[PDB]
Amino acid sequence: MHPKIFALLAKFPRVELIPWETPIQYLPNISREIGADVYIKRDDLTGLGIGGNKIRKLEYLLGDALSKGADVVITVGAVHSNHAFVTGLAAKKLGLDAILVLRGKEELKGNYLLDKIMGIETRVYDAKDSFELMKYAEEIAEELKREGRKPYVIPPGGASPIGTLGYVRAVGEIATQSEVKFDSIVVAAGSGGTLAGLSLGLSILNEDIRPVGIAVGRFGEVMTSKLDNLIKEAAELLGVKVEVRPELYDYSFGEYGKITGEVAQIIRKVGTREGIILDPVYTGKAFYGLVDLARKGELGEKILFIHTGGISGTFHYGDKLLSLL
Template sequence: MNQSLAKALESYPRIPLTRLPTPLQALPSLSAKLGPRLYIKRDDLTDLTFGGDKPRKLEYEVARALAQSTDTLVTCGSSQSNHARLTTAAARKVGMDCVVILSRDQYQQLQGNLLTVYLMGAHVHLVETFNHWDLEPHVQNVCQSLRAQGRKPYVIPVSGTTPHSCLGYIRCGLEVVRQMEEQELRVDAIYTPFGTGGIFTALLLSLREQGITCPLIGISVNQQRASCYEKLETWWKALCSLLHCDPGCSRGEFEIHDEFIGREYGDPTEECLDALLLMGQTEGILLDPVYSGKMMAGFLAHQAAGRWSAEQQILLLHSGGAPVLFAYADELGRHLKKRGVDIHS
């Protein structure tokens, strides 16, 4: 473990919300099919209410909320937001209330993540908005109402990405390197989804500070490349400030790809659904059609183009999100039929 990073992390309060470390596993069946030796970091197996990447981030944000004696977590997202599910779970775990402001869209059926949010007793506001990234005015209105009632809200932004929450993936980077050392594993590239950019940036900094130089490859799920680079700069500067790292230190080789988004965020592209089927039918691991499925589609496109050979080793980050599969049942059913699966209804 990089002692300077670990020591710097000790300066910031954190409340444990989930079981760590998550496994780093080989994918033997998928490797045999594709050629390169493939591994997966199972952040879908954090154990807070169906898991995913958010608990690592929430450990720092919830600690800050408790330190400020707040009583209600307030956040926002799409109708099937993983973040809303896990923020609600985190609030309940520490005895706080939770309000979630969600955008109305074609996936607002009472199932998947939205069902879990109701089951855990969050106060849900479904609002009309062009984009769930534009919910901030609604969040502020809700907070104003809560304060008028004598409540003390604490706002966690869409996707939960803040400079402090990114510390969770600095810790994850320490965890990954330790597991690689234990398994005597040297990887030639690491693939991650790229949403708000917090995970990607924190992993990039953590890996480079530990001397890991392989390419980090981000597959954007919602933003064009130029916007992704802006997010990277924002979180890089903030994290370097928090951790007393030189912001001018080498970032090494990294890539951000925006050609796998599809029409919009959450669009279940054919390549994404094929990737989801491939992982499920070779390894019995379910990806999601929003984040990890897009990441896998990006890797498979690179593999099909001949980028990776049988002698190379690739690590994939599974960021979770399986509950959303149920909200995509119609699209998944049509795709299964398209691929020759006889579905009995």
């Protein structure tokens, strides 16, 4: 925790869901190949549930929630959505209820398989992949509010200014430990909170490190414009200026949830050469978009890849992955 950042987060009521600072490891092989030293930060060992990037976010969201006397959080995401599970399982630990408004092929495997095991409540609605279940969440929060039950709705991937503070803290932690001075930091980009917080923070530490987000789906206008808005409201939350938005390379292969022989080979590669697993929906496309850039000489000499968990995907869509190797 960096002096300044601490000082700026200390006002926000957060729930402490993590005990240790997750490790930053160096990857010998992917460095020899690609040709750059790439370090990986195990945010997938954040510990709660299947771990991952969300846990850090839940700390400021559910921290908040347990304030506004909420007693039943709602969230959204894919049916395989890690965040959805982790937000759910987390909701329950802090002694709260949780309703997941999922969307997709009802498959009893992966995170949806977990969702049940843990008994988290599940509600699916075949609807515009635009993640517009975000409206089903509300009707749901309305009627529950019409019962005197105080809910708490969470935005796709905790893409909330307050959940954003999640990585804003993660940058301070990356600064207390890092022995390496990074030129760029990669990380998949789903809803934009990881890039936001990570960016709001860097800017706060005013570090000459480049915030590189590896888009993994939509992008059009929304993903980059809305990205900027998000990181704006966040700063206005911390009451500070912005130091020009990050980078954002699309490596989604066209559509979210697409599993290609490239997202697939890079899985077996990182796994069989470094001994770390990444998934075919998030982390796998971003490590793949890590090699691409590090070979085109676009990342610098020292690069840190923030592993964001998602371990359930590799099991969920393990069948496709096979038919591709």
